Amino acid sequence: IRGTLDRGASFKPYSGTAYNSFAPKSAPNNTQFRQANNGHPAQTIAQASY
Amino acid sequence: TEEADVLTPDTHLVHAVPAADRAKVEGLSQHAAPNRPNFIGFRDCFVGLM
Amino acid sequence: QAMDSYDPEVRVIDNVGVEDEMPNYCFPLSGVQIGNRSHEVQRNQQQWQNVANSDNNYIGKGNLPAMEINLAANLWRSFLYSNVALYLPDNLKFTPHNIQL
Amino acid sequence: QAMDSYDPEVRVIDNVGVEDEMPNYCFPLSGVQIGNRSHEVQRNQQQWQNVANSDNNYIGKGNLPAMEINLAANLWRSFLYSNVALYLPDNLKFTPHNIQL
C-alpha cells in the first residue's frame, strides 16, 4: 500500500518543547507592556547584551 | 523594536493572570507548559487496516 | 575477548523530547534572603508604638527568591554534545581562538 | 522466592568519569534581574531631552545573572556516597559532633 497520511494537528511526537527549552517557564521575551494605563504610553522591559 | 509572527505550537498557557487587559504589566506573570506528547501511527501488525 | 560495540542511542538518535512539565528551583541555604528587619508594634493610643522588646528581626515580604533551571533538559543536551557533537567530522569543527595547534 | 543480589556498579566501581563538557546554568524566574530604570531620550537641541512619555523601565546592561552547577557531576557523587560511602566499615567512620549515641 502507498498513500498520503495526515496525523492532524494533534500530533506531537515528543515531550517538552523545541523552542527555548532552557528558558524559564515564566521568563517573558522582550515585551513592551503599558504602565497600568493612565497617561503612560508604552514601557520597555528587556536587556542590551551585545 | 519590531513586530514578529510570534506563536506557540508545543506550548500552552498554564497560568493566565488576566483575561483581556492581558498585554499589561500584570500579564507578563503568565507561565507556559509543554503540550502532552501524542504519538500517532499505524496499529500493531496493521490491525484494523483490513 | 570483549567484542567492540556502540551505544544504540548514540548510533541512532531517538529524540523523544524531554519530560520537564515541572519547573525546577534552587533556594538559598537560608530559605529566605535576609536584608531587612521588622518590628512587632502595638496599635491604638497612637499610630503604632514600638515594642522595645528586642529589635532587628528578619521577614521576607513575599515568596523565596529562587533561580530556575530545566534539569531534564540539560542532561539531554549534555548527552548529545558529549556523544555525538564532539565526534562529528573535523570538517564541521573550527580551531579555537588564540591557541597553538 | 526472590534470590538476593547486588548492583554490579556498586560491587565493582567503574569510574568512567562524567560527561559535563557543557556547563549548566540556572536563570532567575524573570530572565533578567530588575534594579534600575532606563529612559528613552531624544538627542539634538541639547545634551538629550527627556521623553516624558511615562518613565521607570527595566533594562539589564549585559547578560543574565546566572549560577553554575556541574549537574552530571553531582549525580555521580551522590551515587557513590549513598551506595558505597555509607556502607564503609565502621572503622573508617567517626561519631558526629554533640550527639548522644
Q: What is the 3-state secondary structure (H, E, C) of C36-92?
A: CCCCCCECCCCCCECCCCCCCCCCCCCCCCCEECCHHHHHHHHHHHHHHHCCCCHHH
Tell me which DSSP letter residue A22 carries: T
Chain A CB contacts of D32 under 8 Å are 27, 46-47
Q: Which residues are CB-neighbours of B30 under 8 A, at least 6 positions away?
A: A28, B13, B15, B16, B17, B22
Give CA separation, D76 vs B48, D9, D80, D84, D85, in Å.
48, 12, 6, 12, 13
Burial A30-44 (b: 16+ CB within 10 A, else e): eeebbbeeeeeeebe
Do the chains contact at C81 and D24, CB–CB below 8 Å? no
Resolution (A): 4.5
- How far apart, in whole angstroms, are the C-alpha atoms of residue C84 and residue C81? 6
Calculate Rg over the CA atoms of chain C: 28
CA dihedral of residues D20, D26, D32, D36 (deg, nearest 10):
-110
CB C35 within 8 A of CB C61: no
Q: What is residue B13's three-state secondary structure? A: strand
Q: Which residues are CB-neighbours of C97 under 8 A, at least 6 positions away?
A: none
- How far apart, in whole angstroms, are the C-alpha atoms of residue D56 and residue D37? 5
Of D28, D58, D62, the CB nearest to A49: D62
- What is the number of alpha carbons within 13 Å of residue A45 lying toward its C-beta? 20
Handedness of CA C61, D29, D41, B24 (dihedral sign): negative
Q: How near does any CA of chain D get to the CA of A50, in Å?
A: 7
- How far apart, in whole angstroms, are the C-alpha atoms of residue B37 and residue D62? 36
Q: What is residue B46's three-state secondary structure? A: helix
Q: Which residues are CB-neighbours of C11 under 8 A, at least 6 positions away?
A: none
Q: What is residue B15's three-state secondary structure? A: strand
Angle formed at CA D91 by CA D89 and CA D96, multiple of 5 degrees: 100
Q: Is B31 on the interface with A (CB under 8 A)?
A: yes
Do the chains contact at C78 and D19, CB–CB below 8 Å? yes
What kind and span of H or E run contains C9?
helix C8-11
Q: What is the 3-state secondary structure (H, E, C) of chain D?
A: CCCCCCCHHHHCCCCCCCCCCCCCEEEECCCCCCCCCCCCCECCCCCCECCCCCCCCEEEECCCCCEECCHHHHHHHHHHHHHHHCCCCHHHCCCCCCCCC
Do the chains contact at C16 and A14, CB–CB below 8 Å? yes
Burial C50-86 (b: 16+ CB within 10 A, else e): eeeeeeeeeeeeeeeeebbbbbbbbbbbbbeebbeee
Q: Which of A12, A22, A26 to mutate to test the interface with C (most CBs of C within 10 A)?
A: A22
Q: Is C75 on the interface with D (CB under 8 A)?
A: yes
Which grid coordinates belong to D54? Answer: 511615562
